[PDB]
Structure formats: structure tokens, C-alpha cells
Scaffold this active site. Structure first.
Site, PDB file in Angstrom:
ATOM      1  N   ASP A  44       0.664  -1.264  -0.047  1.00 23.10           N
ATOM      2  CA  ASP A  44       0.076   0.079   0.041  1.00 23.10           C
ATOM      3  C   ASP A  44       0.829   1.278  -0.071  1.00 23.10           C
ATOM      4  O   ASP A  44       1.736   1.510   0.929  1.00 23.10           O
ATOM      5  CB  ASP A  44      -0.736   0.231   1.247  1.00 23.10           C
ATOM      6  N   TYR A  49       2.791  10.174   0.565  1.00 26.29           N
ATOM      7  CA  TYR A  49       3.881   9.452   1.475  1.00 26.29           C
ATOM      8  C   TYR A  49       5.489   9.752   1.030  1.00 26.29           C
ATOM      9  O   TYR A  49       6.254   9.677   1.981  1.00 26.29           O
ATOM     10  CB  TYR A  49       3.774   7.916   1.571  1.00 26.29           C
ATOM     11  N   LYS A  78      -2.632   5.773  -4.317  1.00 28.00           N
ATOM     12  CA  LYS A  78      -3.755   6.940  -4.258  1.00 28.00           C
ATOM     13  C   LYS A  78      -3.424   8.286  -4.834  1.00 28.00           C
ATOM     14  O   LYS A  78      -2.334   8.481  -4.687  1.00 28.00           O
ATOM     15  CB  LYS A  78      -3.830   6.823  -2.444  1.00 28.00           C
ATOM     16  N   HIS A 111      -7.637   9.214  -2.399  1.00 26.65           N
ATOM     17  CA  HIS A 111      -6.967   9.123  -1.113  1.00 26.65           C
ATOM     18  C   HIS A 111      -7.900   9.820  -0.018  1.00 26.65           C
ATOM     19  O   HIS A 111      -8.009   9.179   1.205  1.00 26.65           O
ATOM     20  CB  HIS A 111      -5.739  10.065  -1.246  1.00 26.65           C
TER      21      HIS A 111
HETATM   22  N1  LIG Z   1      -5.852   5.609   3.210  1.00 23.86           N
HETATM   23  C1  LIG Z   1      -5.365   6.429   4.235  1.00 23.86           C
HETATM   24  O1  LIG Z   1      -5.811   7.837   4.352  1.00 23.86           O
HETATM   25  C2  LIG Z   1      -4.329   6.033   5.066  1.00 23.86           C
HETATM   26  C3  LIG Z   1      -3.590   4.963   4.831  1.00 23.86           C
HETATM   27  N2  LIG Z   1      -2.661   4.083   5.826  1.00 23.86           N
HETATM   28  C4  LIG Z   1      -1.947   3.037   5.255  1.00 23.86           C
HETATM   29  O2  LIG Z   1      -2.123   2.185   6.360  1.00 23.86           O
HETATM   30  C5  LIG Z   1      -0.861   1.604   6.705  1.00 23.86           C
HETATM   31  C6  LIG Z   1      -1.031   1.136   8.079  1.00 23.86           C
HETATM   32  O3  LIG Z   1      -1.245   2.197   9.072  1.00 23.86           O
HETATM   33  P1  LIG Z   1      -0.341   3.159   9.896  1.00 23.86           P
HETATM   34  O4  LIG Z   1      -0.809   4.209  10.103  1.00 23.86           O
HETATM   35  O5  LIG Z   1       0.899   3.182   9.174  1.00 23.86           O
HETATM   36  O6  LIG Z   1      -0.095   2.375  11.280  1.00 23.86           O
HETATM   37  P2  LIG Z   1       0.043   0.582  11.877  1.00 23.86           P
HETATM   38  O7  LIG Z   1      -1.368   0.526  12.606  1.00 23.86           O
HETATM   39  O8  LIG Z   1      -0.036  -0.290  10.658  1.00 23.86           O
HETATM   40  O9  LIG Z   1       1.187   0.883  12.762  1.00 23.86           O
HETATM   41  C7  LIG Z   1       2.385   1.003  12.297  1.00 23.86           C
HETATM   42  C8  LIG Z   1       3.370   1.022  13.710  1.00 23.86           C
HETATM   43  O10 LIG Z   1       3.193  -0.125  14.146  1.00 23.86           O
HETATM   44  C9  LIG Z   1       4.623  -0.529  14.462  1.00 23.86           C
HETATM   45  N3  LIG Z   1       4.697  -2.129  14.406  1.00 23.86           N
HETATM   46  C10 LIG Z   1       4.292  -2.894  13.152  1.00 23.86           C
HETATM   47  N4  LIG Z   1       4.477  -3.935  13.331  1.00 23.86           N
HETATM   48  C11 LIG Z   1       4.471  -4.179  14.668  1.00 23.86           C
HETATM   49  C12 LIG Z   1       4.616  -5.504  15.516  1.00 23.86           C
HETATM   50  N5  LIG Z   1       4.499  -6.640  15.019  1.00 23.86           N
HETATM   51  N6  LIG Z   1       4.781  -5.241  17.121  1.00 23.86           N
HETATM   52  C13 LIG Z   1       5.019  -3.895  17.413  1.00 23.86           C
HETATM   53  N7  LIG Z   1       4.911  -2.636  16.614  1.00 23.86           N
HETATM   54  C14 LIG Z   1       4.542  -3.055  15.517  1.00 23.86           C
HETATM   55  C15 LIG Z   1       5.561  -0.068  13.496  1.00 23.86           C
HETATM   56  O11 LIG Z   1       6.672   0.116  13.781  1.00 23.86           O
HETATM   57  P3  LIG Z   1       8.135  -0.056  12.953  1.00 23.86           P
HETATM   58  O12 LIG Z   1       7.956   0.262  11.654  1.00 23.86           O
HETATM   59  O13 LIG Z   1       8.984   0.914  13.570  1.00 23.86           O
HETATM   60  O14 LIG Z   1       8.265  -1.610  12.902  1.00 23.86           O
HETATM   61  C16 LIG Z   1       4.920   1.577  13.336  1.00 23.86           C
HETATM   62  O15 LIG Z   1       5.308   2.330  14.131  1.00 23.86           O
HETATM   63  C17 LIG Z   1      -0.020   3.005   6.204  1.00 23.86           C
HETATM   64  O16 LIG Z   1       1.378   2.709   6.420  1.00 23.86           O
HETATM   65  C18 LIG Z   1      -0.434   3.362   5.077  1.00 23.86           C
HETATM   66  O17 LIG Z   1       0.101   2.513   3.941  1.00 23.86           O
HETATM   67  C19 LIG Z   1      -2.936   4.735   6.844  1.00 23.86           C
HETATM   68  C20 LIG Z   1      -3.424   6.130   7.408  1.00 23.86           C
HETATM   69  C21 LIG Z   1      -4.327   6.613   6.335  1.00 23.86           C
HETATM   70  O1  LIG Z   2      -3.652  10.423   4.824  1.00 17.65           O
HETATM   71  C1  LIG Z   2      -2.706   9.564   5.064  1.00 17.65           C
HETATM   72  O2  LIG Z   2      -2.759   8.360   4.199  1.00 17.65           O
HETATM   73  C2  LIG Z   2      -1.843   9.384   6.237  1.00 17.65           C
HETATM   74  O3  LIG Z   2      -1.579  10.444   6.994  1.00 17.65           O
HETATM   75  C3  LIG Z   2      -1.001  11.550   6.293  1.00 17.65           C
HETATM   76  C4  LIG Z   2       0.181  11.126   5.318  1.00 17.65           C
HETATM   77  C5  LIG Z   2       0.662  12.198   4.766  1.00 17.65           C
HETATM   78  F1  LIG Z   2       1.964  11.704   3.887  1.00 17.65           F
HETATM   79  C6  LIG Z   2       0.738  13.423   4.895  1.00 17.65           C
HETATM   80  C7  LIG Z   2      -0.525  13.773   5.760  1.00 17.65           C
HETATM   81  C8  LIG Z   2      -1.143  13.022   6.465  1.00 17.65           C
HETATM   82  C9  LIG Z   2      -2.347  13.093   6.941  1.00 17.65           C
HETATM   83  S1  LIG Z   2      -2.170  14.700   8.362  1.00 17.65           S
HETATM   84  N1  LIG Z   2      -3.598  12.512   7.064  1.00 17.65           N
HETATM   85  C10 LIG Z   2      -4.805  12.752   7.670  1.00 17.65           C
HETATM   86  C11 LIG Z   2      -5.543  13.342   6.658  1.00 17.65           C
HETATM   87  C12 LIG Z   2      -5.312  14.214   5.584  1.00 17.65           C
HETATM   88  C13 LIG Z   2      -6.355  14.916   4.990  1.00 17.65           C
HETATM   89  C14 LIG Z   2      -7.589  14.830   5.167  1.00 17.65           C
HETATM   90 BR1  LIG Z   2      -9.033  15.654   4.151  1.00 17.65          BR
HETATM   91  C15 LIG Z   2      -7.997  14.480   6.538  1.00 17.65           C
HETATM   92  C16 LIG Z   2      -7.034  13.806   7.189  1.00 17.65           C
HETATM   93  F2  LIG Z   2      -7.361  13.262   8.131  1.00 17.65           F
END
Ligand SMILES: NC(=O)C1=CN([C@@H]2O[C@H](COP(=O)(O)OP(=O)(O)OC[C@H]3O[C@@H](n4cnc5c(N)ncnc54)[C@H](OP(=O)(O)O)[C@@H]3O)[C@@H](O)[C@H]2O)C=CC1
Ligand SMILES: O=C(O)COc1cc(F)ccc1C(=S)NCc1ccc(Br)cc1F
EC number: 1.1.1.21
Length: 312
Positions: A44, A49, A78, A111
Site C-alpha cells: 500500500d 507519502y 492513491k 485518497h
Molecule cells: N488511506 C489513508 O488515508 C491511510 C492509509 N494508511 C495506510 O495504512 C498503513 C498502516 O497504518 P499506519 O498508520 O502506518 O499504522 P499501523 O497501525 O500499521 O502501525 C504502524 C506502527 O506499528 C509498528 N509495528 C508494526 N508491526 C509491529 C509489531 N509486530 N509489533 C509492534 N509494533 C509494530 C510500526 O513500527 P516499525 O515500523 O518501527 O516496526 C509502526 O510504528 C499505512 O502505512 C498506510 O499504508 C494509513 C493511514 C491513512
Molecule cells: O492520509 C494518510 O494516508 C496518512 O496521513 C498522512 C500522510 C501524509 F503523507 C501526509 C499527511 C497525512 C495526514 S495529516 N493525513 C490525515 C488527513 C489528511 C487529509 C484529510 Br482531508 C484528512 C485527514 F485526516
């Protein structure tokens, strides 16, 4: 458990993928290489990012090494909010393609439902700190996404952070050509999303759960509830002789969700994949669901007045 779920475009999507938000550019190439070596077949990604070039180096190397074939990978990215314009969508997709070293994406998501003013800044603000909207609506953005399917740039299109009414807008679009394949939303035991999941699943849209571990590395974390440290979740993990993270990953899988935990730690990347040889009971599942508290990792105050901001 079966490793892939059937999408409404006819393609199969691996239910477990590697997240890449916050993965440092100097670590993410190795993270993705390790992930592919240990079995991950879904990554993903997102332009916002700022690490797609480095993700792409890993993908390309593993394809060149013939560790995998391209058809066996499922690469998701995205469209960022500053590219909700007819005339910008294709180029945004193509920049992602070029960075990832790909000639197509398996899935391309809007996104966030909100469009922002185009320009260099990912979050253009007014002098009072409010995001500057675009006038372009989710329906016109969706039509632009449909064109990408028709041009061969993407195999599937979908949405992310769309609320119930926004999903419905998309489904009710006059002249809709392709339904969204996926809605990617935050989902974990403190934000269980039952209502939005049931709506989406009832419409055949597959839901991907992001931040399944509660995003402990989120940059706005405060010393906030912690899934990984919740002793009630630790207890379920102990009972199954698994880690808390493994429980947190298996949980959405048994809800018929896709899940995308992020790590750059090789041992954790491997740990997180070892979730196909145990089952949570129905009682475990209901118990985990009971921890809902409507807590979001991803929300953003600067964007809350945008017409299409998804959350209240
Ligand atoms: N569509 C959207 O708006 C969004 C999409 N996403 C996607 O979802 C993905 C996952 O969500 P994200 O917010 O990154 O967070 P996660 O809930 O996946 O948590 C990531 C964190 O957990 C830690 N971690 C991972 N595996 C373990 C484990 N086995 N034991 C302990 N700690 C662990 C990592 O540490 P470390 O890396 O140091 O090992 C990191 O600090 C994102 O990376 C992105 O690809 C996320 C937010 C928004
Ligand atoms: O967004 C991600 O995937 C992970 O998070 C992010 C990842 C980035 F690389 C940059 C900003 C964000 C933020 S601050 N995201 C939250 C966010 C952004 C836009 C709007 Br509309 C609402 C909202 F809640």
C-alpha cells in the site's frame, strides 16, 4: 485462511499488505524487499507519502531477481487531494507509476474525498490555517478515475476515507461506469467501523483496514489509548500463543477485510505475515469489537470545514 479476496472488477486482492506511510526513504526499499521475500504480495503506497521512488526500487529489484512475477503483485496507490482536477488526474497517476517502476497499478484510490487547490503544497492553507478547497466534486473526480481504467493505467479504482453518504454518492452517480472496488478506511478495535463496513460490504465494495495497530508512530501521538499495550488484547494474544500485533492483524481478516500493517523492522514484517495458521473464536471477535470507542488516528483539524470532509 485463503490469501486473496475477490473484487468487483474480477481480480483477486491479497488480504494482507505492507503499509508504507512513515516508512523512511532510507529504510523502505529494504522493508519492501524483505516483505516480498517473506511472502507479501500487496504493498500500500501513496504519492503523498513521499517514498514511492524507494518503494519502486524494491519492487523492481524483486521483479528483476524473479522472486515474483508482476502478475503476482498487487500494488495500490492513491490520488492526492491537490490532484482532484480533470486535467491533473492522469499525470498524478503517471508520476506514481513512474516512481513505482510500474506500467499499471492494481488499485488506485481517491485518497480522501476532499479536493484541495492544486500546487506544490500538499496542504495549501489560507492565512488562518484552513485548507484551501478545490471546487471539483467527488463525482467528477470519479469520472477521471474511470478514465484511468479505460486507458490501461490501473486495473481497479476505489476510494478511501469516504463516509457512508459519499460511498452512496459514488454508487448513485449518473452514468456510473465502474463501481469502486475498495473503500480503504481506518479500522481497529477502538474504531470498529461496523456501520460503514456493513454498508460497503452490502454493496460489494471490499473494505481495507488501515492503521490496524493504532498507528503508534503517527506524528501527532500523545502519551492516547494504545492497542498494542491493551492488556485485554494481550490476553487474547497470549491465549493463542501469538503477538498482540498478530491478533490485531487477524481480527480484520476474519471480518472479510483487507489489512495493511506498516513496519520497517524486518522481524516485525515477518511476524505480521504469520497470521494464516490460527483462528480467533467468535467470542474473541465479539470481545475485540466490544473495545470500540470511536477513536481515530487519522483526522485533521485544518480540513474540517471542507465541504467534503468525511468525519464528524
Ligand atoms: N488511506 C489513508 O488515508 C491511510 C492509509 N494508511 C495506510 O495504512 C498503513 C498502516 O497504518 P499506519 O498508520 O502506518 O499504522 P499501523 O497501525 O500499521 O502501525 C504502524 C506502527 O506499528 C509498528 N509495528 C508494526 N508491526 C509491529 C509489531 N509486530 N509489533 C509492534 N509494533 C509494530 C510500526 O513500527 P516499525 O515500523 O518501527 O516496526 C509502526 O510504528 C499505512 O502505512 C498506510 O499504508 C494509513 C493511514 C491513512
Ligand atoms: O492520509 C494518510 O494516508 C496518512 O496521513 C498522512 C500522510 C501524509 F503523507 C501526509 C499527511 C497525512 C495526514 S495529516 N493525513 C490525515 C488527513 C489528511 C487529509 C484529510 Br482531508 C484528512 C485527514 F485526516
Amino acid at each position: 485462511m485463503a490469501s486473496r479476496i475477490l473484487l468487483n472488477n474480477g481480480a483477486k486482492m491479497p488480504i494482507l499488505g505492507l503499509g508504507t506511510w512513515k516508512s523512511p526513504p532510507g529504510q523502505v526499499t529494504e522493508a519492501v524487499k524483505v516483505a516480498i521475500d517473506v511472502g507479501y504480495r500487496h504493498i500500500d503506497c501513496a504519492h503523498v507519502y513521499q517514498n514511492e521512488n524507494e518503494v519502486g526500487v524494491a519492487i523492481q529489484e524483486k521483479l528483476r531477481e524473479q522472486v515474483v512475477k508482476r502478475e503476482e503483485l498487487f500494488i495500490v496507490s492513491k490520488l492526492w487531494c491537490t490532484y482532484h482536477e480533470k486535467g491533473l488526474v492522469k499525470g498524478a497517476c503517471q508520476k506514481t507509476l513512474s516512481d513505482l517502476k510500474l506500467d499499471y497499478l492494481d488499485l488506485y484510490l481517491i485518497h480522501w474525498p476532499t479536493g484541495f487547490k492544486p500546487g506544490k503544497e500538499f496542504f495549501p492553507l489560507d492565512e488562518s490555517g484552513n485548507v484551501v478547497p478545490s471546487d471539483t466534486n467527488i463525482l467528477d473526480t470519479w469520472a477521471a478515475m474511470e478514465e484511468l481504467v479505460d486507458e490501461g493505467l490501473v486495473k481497479a479504482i476505489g476510494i478511501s476515507n469516504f463516509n457512508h453518504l459519499q460511498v452512496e454518492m459514488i454508487l448513485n452517480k449518473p452514468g456510473l461506469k465502474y463501481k469502486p472496488a475498495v473503500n480503504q478506511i481506518e479500522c481497529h478495535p477502538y474504531l470498529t467501523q461496523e456501520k460503514l463496513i456493513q454498508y460497503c460490504q452490502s454493496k460489494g465494495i471490499v473494505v481495507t483496514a488501515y492503521s490496524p495497530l493504532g498507528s503508534p508512530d503517527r506524528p501527532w501521538a500523545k502519551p492516547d489509548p494504545s492497542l498494542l499495550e491493551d492488556p485485554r488484547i494481550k490476553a487474547i494474544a497470549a491465549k493463542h500463543n501469538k503477538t498482540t500485533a498478530q491478533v490485531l492483524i487477524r481480527f480484520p481478516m476474519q471480518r472479510n477485510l483487507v489489512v495493511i500493517p506498516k513496519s520497517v523492522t524486518p522481524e516485525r514484517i515477518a511476524e505480521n505475515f504469520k497470521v494464516f495458521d490460527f483462528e480467533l473464536s467468535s467470542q474473541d471477535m465479539t470481545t475485540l469489537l466490544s473495545y470500540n470507542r470511536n477513536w481515530r488516528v487519522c483526522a485533521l483539524l485544518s480540513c474540517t470545514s471542507h465541504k467534503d470532509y468525511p468525519f464528524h
